[PDB]
């Protein structure tokens, strides 16, 4: 089906990335205290 694109897969992958990158950046910021 060339007239269909699955946007929910890309949406879920982007939201998983957006959660993981934020938790990783906050762990980098709050290293010790």
């Amino acid at each position: 089906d060339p007239f269909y694109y699955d946007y929910e897969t890309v949406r879920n992958g982007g939201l998983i990335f957006a959660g993981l990158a934020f938790i990783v950046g906050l762990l980098i910021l709050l290293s010790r205290r």
Binding site: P2, F3, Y5
Partner: protein, 294 residues
């Protein structure tokens, strides 16, 4: 001051704080820098264009159900004219005349390009694959005589002089798209019309309940007996493999409108492939407002 000190202090020969060579060197730097940036931009554009196939676009999900349009290109879906006034309907008739130029039989008489297709609506025509593996393809030809009482081989105003106006409905071209008419359960679509397995059906009704009793009689003209698009024409292959492609049309005439009232009319196609939208008021469907002043 701002008169003689900052602009043209001439004891060190400076215009706005720079000498002549200090202007030349920075201008040479900037023309060289912008030349190198233009070179990098053109090179990256060419490497991107090497990934593009010239027979089929990369993505087709944003035109995925096509749109339905009507040929007198009007400005706010309004049609307003006085039939005893040949200046009010001039732009409408001129636009209809400029559209149906390439549908005259004096324009489809090549035989290496055009071909006499059927006279009954039929199955879609698959002409191979999208890869020039067979060069230019041929096009089924569309007779203007099938638009009868809305062609030009009669009165030359397409009905606008005698009250009853007429519009020409077409579907938006999508490459490789084959419309699927609704399957028989004898129920599915709405409400009832003459079912053909090779016609995409199209109906034009009144929008509100107060317009259903005022639109009067509606006449359809096209190929065949059941009102819609015949499926012979439909695997379109692009303007590289098929220039001079003629899409099928459907003429609709409103013969018994009521006068001095803006009437709202919705036209709509039905299929397994045809989708609708509340944000896009032209997808598989369109609306028009017709007022005949007298």
């Amino acid at each position: 001051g701002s008169w003689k000190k900052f602009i043209w202090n001439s004891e060190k020969k400076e215009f706005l704080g720079r000498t002549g060579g200090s202007w030349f060197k920075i201008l040479l730097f900037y023309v060289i820098f912008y030349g190198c940036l233009a070179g990098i931009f053109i090179g990256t554009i060419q490497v991107m264009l090497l990934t593009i196939s010239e027979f089929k676009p990369t993505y087709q999900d944003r035109v995925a159900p096509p749109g339905l349009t009507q040929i007198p290109q009007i400005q706010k879906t309004e049609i307003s004219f006085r039939p005893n006034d040949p200046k009010s309907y001039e732009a409408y008739v001129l636009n209809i005349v400029r559209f149906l130029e390439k549908y005259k039989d004096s324009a489809q008489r090549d035989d290496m390009i055009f071909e006499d297709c059927g006279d009954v609506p039929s199955e879609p025509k698959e002409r191979g694959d999208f890869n020039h593996e067979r060069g230019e393809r041929k096009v089924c030809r569309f007779k203007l005589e099938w638009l009868g009482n809305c062609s030009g081989l009669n009165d030359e105003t397409y009905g606008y002089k005698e009250g009853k106006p007429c519009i020409i409905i077409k579907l938006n071209r999508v490459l490789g798209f084959k419309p699927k008419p609704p399957k028989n359960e004898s129920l599915e679509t709405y409400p009832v019309m003459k079912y053909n397995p090779n016609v995409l059906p199209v109906q034009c009704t009144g929008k509100r309940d107060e317009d259903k009793d005022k639109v009067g009689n509606v006449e359809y003209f096209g190929l065949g007996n059941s009102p819609g698009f015949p499926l012979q024409y439909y695997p379109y292959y692009g303007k590289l493999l098929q220039p001079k492609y003629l899409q099928p049309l459907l003429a609709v005439q409103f013969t018994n409108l009521t006068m001095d009232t803006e009437i709202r009319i919705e036209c709509k196609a039905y299929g397994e492939n045809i989708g609708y939208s509340e944000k896009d008021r032209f997808q598989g469907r369109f609306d028009v407002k017709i007022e005949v002043k007298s």
